[PDB]
Amino acid sequence: GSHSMRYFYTSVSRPGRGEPRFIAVGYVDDTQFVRFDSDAASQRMEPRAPWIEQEGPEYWDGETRKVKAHSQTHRVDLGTLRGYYNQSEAGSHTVQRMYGCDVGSDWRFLRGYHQYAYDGKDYIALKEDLRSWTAADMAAQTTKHKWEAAHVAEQLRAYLEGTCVEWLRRYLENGKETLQRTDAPKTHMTHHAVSDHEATLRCWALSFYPAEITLTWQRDGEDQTQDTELVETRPAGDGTFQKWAAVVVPSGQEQRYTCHVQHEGLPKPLTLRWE
Amino acid sequence: MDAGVIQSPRHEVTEMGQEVTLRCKPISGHNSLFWYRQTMMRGLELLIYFNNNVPIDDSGMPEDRFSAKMPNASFSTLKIQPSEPRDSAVYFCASSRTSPTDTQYFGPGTRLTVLEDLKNVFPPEVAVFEPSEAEISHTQKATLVCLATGFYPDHVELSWWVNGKEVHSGVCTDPQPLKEQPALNDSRYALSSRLRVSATFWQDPRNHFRCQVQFYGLSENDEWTQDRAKPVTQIVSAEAWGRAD
Amino acid sequence: TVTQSQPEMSVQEAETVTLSCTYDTSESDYYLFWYKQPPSRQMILVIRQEAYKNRFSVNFQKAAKSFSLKISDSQLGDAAMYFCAFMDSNYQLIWGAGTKLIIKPNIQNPDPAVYQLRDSKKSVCLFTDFDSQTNVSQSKDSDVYITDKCVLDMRSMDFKSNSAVAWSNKFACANAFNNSIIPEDTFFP
């Protein structure tokens, strides 16, 4: 019964080509609901889900001012980190921020997250206790001491347990019809003989939400972890997700294998046989 | 360093159509810089503020007459071209460490008076009035009273000097000048001040008292071709010697 | 918007005064500020309070939206224009109307009098040594000039006194302050 709200920020420096590229997105669970693109014409925080469109002009003015402020922050962070690491002014670098909060089954605050990354590597992260930081190197130690000086973990824990969860609850009740739904996966199998030596069984799971799913193959009850291909859970484009798991089988033994699908939308895990 | 936010000039008296350039150096480690202006009717008005030399908000800036820039993390400039009388105000520069949410530290401010014609500028006439023997007998105290009269605009700074050393004790100056003709809108101003000392100190004929008034007016570049002492920035003073009785 | 109800307040030296301030905003995270501006025009912060958390203190009531400044043991140097400020997602200080705090000194031995002073190189009248309950008013006739009262502090002798100056050419000191309720014990030499 856990629910989450996340904000993702990506800033990429374009040296000698103007300002950095800034893109922000907000998620509730696996549903995107806001976006902002530095290069878009609107220069505004835009809706990407119906249940957020009902918010008033104060909300969108506010989130636009804040997201532009985070755009400025990351712009400065690119120059700052370039200094920390003594890097040339000609290379293009990337700062990424991610922060949000989780509420539990009782709809109270459960967990908080807030962390940065430079060029795809961890820079600094807020620890689970929401009171201390994790610094990977000298540069991150600098930031850590700066934030420790300004009591950042205090203001941030106050936000994560306050405004963050309050409006996560508001979004969950406004988007009750879609955010609190559960689309169970539609499943089936396919068989493609790659030879007389062996054939390919493929187990399909389609149109399911949320994206958390588990697919396993079994040969006579034992787990076929090896000889099993597993594809990455991909988006369908309509708000649902897809995933398939394939296994190679000697011809004539297709009835010996079994696909087991596990998803929170199913009351009992599914068992699929080629018999 | 003896420094906070720094502004120049402290005073600026110029005519309409002239260019006005206000300069600001923020506190050393501060990355946010703010430009305010203050008046009686409109109060405090945020004109523009930068963060890390980037202009964040300029909605308070008037249009095509005002232009602000910040080429360094340690310098900003606000330019009015051309200047008009309605721009008259006290333009403040402030700064904060990282963001607009952080405490803002303000500068002393530039007092800008844009006049319609510089021929209304007059320096003050200063005079010192010596203490009365009644006060000396009644309370064994002596109060000198300085009077600066007939200046315009009201850019004055009054200080007291005893034997070449500026004094701050026993001094009281009107915080605001008063109009010599309160009825009329435009009018020359007056400013009073009092320096009180022990009576025995005033009865020493060796002591020298001086009322000093700094007046801010025309600069030497501004043209002035009239039969009048060019009302330039100057120091008009009036002195008095101690009486033995 | 920030509301400072009373635009002016008077308090006796060494007593406590409370300046009220209430705001009105829907936004859920904000900042409150008390700034001080003496006659020197130098804006100086007095107290900062964030929504999530000396002689100056504040009663911060989030419920009633009250941010009141409380100055205990008033010092003469506190007389200034006090502004209540507020900031939200607009990231711009929103200023109240301002409250002028006036501090009336405690003079032990009031000795009210009006003396006549004469130029060294004209005549002025000095009303001095009166208790701070006395108020000086401008004259109803525009030909004579009277200044508001001014508190001067002689530190070496540890003695403060009030003073106001009237002057004109036309004029006598015995009637220059007719528009003011001068004390009855006034000394007229």
Binding site: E63, K66, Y159, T163 | N51, T101 | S89
Partner: peptide
């Protein structure tokens, strides 16, 4: 709702 604070590295 996003966090109000400007937070620099």
């Amino acid at each position: 709702k996003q966090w109000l604070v400007w937070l620099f590295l």
